[PDB]
Amino acid sequence: AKKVNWYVSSSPRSPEKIQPELKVLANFEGSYWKGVKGYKAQEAFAKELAALPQFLGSTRDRVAPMKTYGFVFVDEEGYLRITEAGKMLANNRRPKDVFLKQLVKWQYPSFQHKGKEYPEEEWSINPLVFVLSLLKKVGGLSKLDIAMFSLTATNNNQVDEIAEEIMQFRNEREKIKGQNKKLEFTENYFFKRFEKIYGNVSHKSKIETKMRNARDVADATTRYFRYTGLFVARGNQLVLNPEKSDLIDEIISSSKVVKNYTRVEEFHEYYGNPSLPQFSFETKEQLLDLAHRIRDENTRLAEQLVEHFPNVKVEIQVLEDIYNSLNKKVDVETLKDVIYHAKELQLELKKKKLQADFNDPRQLEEVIDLLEVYHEKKNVIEEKIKARFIANKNTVFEWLTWNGFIILGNALEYKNNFVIDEELQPVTHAAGNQPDMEIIYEDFIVLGEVTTSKGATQFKMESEPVTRHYLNKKKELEKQGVEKELYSLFIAPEINKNTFEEFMKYNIVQNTRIIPLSLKQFNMLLMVQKKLIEKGRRLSSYDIKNLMVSLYRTTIESERKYTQIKAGLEETLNNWVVDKEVRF
């Protein structure tokens, strides 16, 4: 009956989705939750959950991950309880830190995973710390390496042996010539490995389910671990975050599989405590030093940017607002919040640092050429993307278009709604109830709405969400009294006619300002900025506003036939390009 793998559940597959599910479950604290007498509570939870804008945005499978990560448990009288770590996550306090400390203590066996299926003879592992130690030996792991090698590790001591087996696998794959030959080798090695492991002696199709489940789990694994900040992506590989060298060493040194797991209460008194483990620097004195160190990092970043990129003035002010808390209170809790917020803000500063990086024509052209990959056939897109990113090609297209906006410059905020990690690499697609990004300028806002969909499916996929996103934002800006005009820029490699006409109808009838631009037109903008930078010049905030206003006016003034509006947009775009007096 013994399980032979650990897992990060795909329910949900990215970590940030736990928090709204947990905040709902917290409402059922103190409900009877065990066996049959537990029915009406689990009933009513499952239901109030369905109600979320995580509808815009099966039921013990929903809660098991919350149990596994030590957010909730059932006490011996049978009632649902929320741990201190669950409470903190439900209130949305320092959530990445909460994940960090929970996933560090995560162990097998555990109250959730003990007894027959998890014997101590085979089982003794902290999955996250195991992958940290494995990365110290093999350098990086793709999603496929994790599925193949890491998930079936059951004991912390197995690090070196599994590292050696991976290095042997890479050395043997290296000998296979031909990229699809290398794929087979891999796929057959994967088959044969899971065959042993689940395979004592339609058999073939049974282990292929194991394989496919493992790949699913390995995706979730990389997104959860990247959340903690301990790991980042470098290409298609999960790697250690270079900025957390010391913490990773301290975590590795102090990690343990505690023996007192069989009793719910005692176990959760340790496991549900989001202060544990206590790191060496978490004293008032050393948190002050950590807060000040981060303050200097951020000031250096801002000071290096501020003359040529004065839009960093946004972060410099937020940074002051954050550190102003210590004029009022200096205790461990206030310092933790300052540190958390300042790291968040460091990530905002790194987005604006990309504007500087893109002064290098080869860095700007890297983003153009990756966007151009999306004009290629589907098999080529999947291949070129797989070799350069963890995230799927859809999430990567959001991330490339977003870097597109950063190249154009001038925004107050480049608000990606897809999740990025601590090195700004893409993780998870924007939620169904958000546009892919929201680019906020001084006096206008653009919602970037992107897709690699085509034809009828694009229409089905995009027509309603894009107009809904635009109208919800416009209502929300009116609510807040923000008086900036709102545009959505809709980008696809091939804009479907029916999708286009539907946005045209919405602009003229429902007063939206949705502008459809082909990937080809969007890359012309980037080419234009590249040529301006060659000549010591760059687009101003005015120039971007003027394009959006111009193209918008064409959508509502043009003669109504599709070919007429579409020709009008090319002309409006061509006028704006000519005016910049470039090569093209």
CB 322 within 8 A of CB 342: yes
**Which CATH number does the domain 360-584 belong to among 2.40.40.20, 1.20.1260.10, 3.40.91.50, 3.40.50.720?**
3.40.91.50
Q: From its phi and psi, is residue 237 left (phi > 0), alpha (psi between -120 and 50) or beta?
A: beta
Q: Please list the residues that pair with 80 across neighbouring strands.
A: 74
Measure the CA–CA gap between 555 and 564, rounded to whole angstroms: 10
**At what resolution in Å was this solved?**
1.9
Measure the CA–CA gap between 211 and 264, rounded to whole angstroms: 33
**Nearest residue to 408 via CA among 528, 517, 578:** 528
CA gyration radius, the chain: 26
Approach to solving: X-ray
Q: What is the CATH T-level fold of the domain 279-359, as seen in this structure?
A: Substrate Binding Domain Of Dnak; Chain:A; Domain 2 (1.20.1270)
Q: Please list the residues that pair with 487 across neighbouring strands.
A: 446
**Helix-, strand-, coil-residue percentages of the chain, each rounded to 5:** 60, 10, 30
Measure the CA–CA gap between 501 and 298, rounded to whole angstroms: 46
Beta-sheet strand order (sheet of 413-416)? 413-416, 437-440, 444-450, 485-492, 514-518
Reduced to 3 states (helix: H, G, I; strand: E, B; else coil), residue 41 is helix
The H or E element spanning position 189 is helix 179-198
Domain spans of the chain, in order of start: 14-278, 279-359, 360-584
Work out whether strand 80-82 and strand 72-74 pair parallel, antiparallel, or are unpaired: antiparallel
CB 334 within 8 A of CB 326: yes
Q: Virtual CA dihedral for 54, 59, 62, 64, nearest 10 degrees?
A: 160
Measure the CA–CA gap between 252 and 284, rounded to whole angstroms: 23
Show the tokens assigned to 563: 């070919």
CA 111 to each of CA 64, 220, 431, 491, 538: distance values in angstroms, whole numbers, following the listed order:
12, 22, 33, 49, 59
Q: Please list the residues that pair with 449 across neighbouring strands.
A: 490
CB atoms within 10 A of CB 178: 9
203, amino acid identity:
H
CA 118 to each of CA 112, 121, 294, 399: distance values in angstroms, whole numbers, following the listed order:
10, 9, 42, 41
| Helices of type H across 199-279 | 203-228, 245-254, 264-271
Q: Please list the residues that pair with 440 across neighbouring strands.
A: 413, 445
Measure the CA–CA gap between 496 and 508, rounded to whole angstroms: 19
How far is CA 105 from its chain centroid? 23
Q: Please list the residues that pair with 72 across neighbouring strands.
A: 82
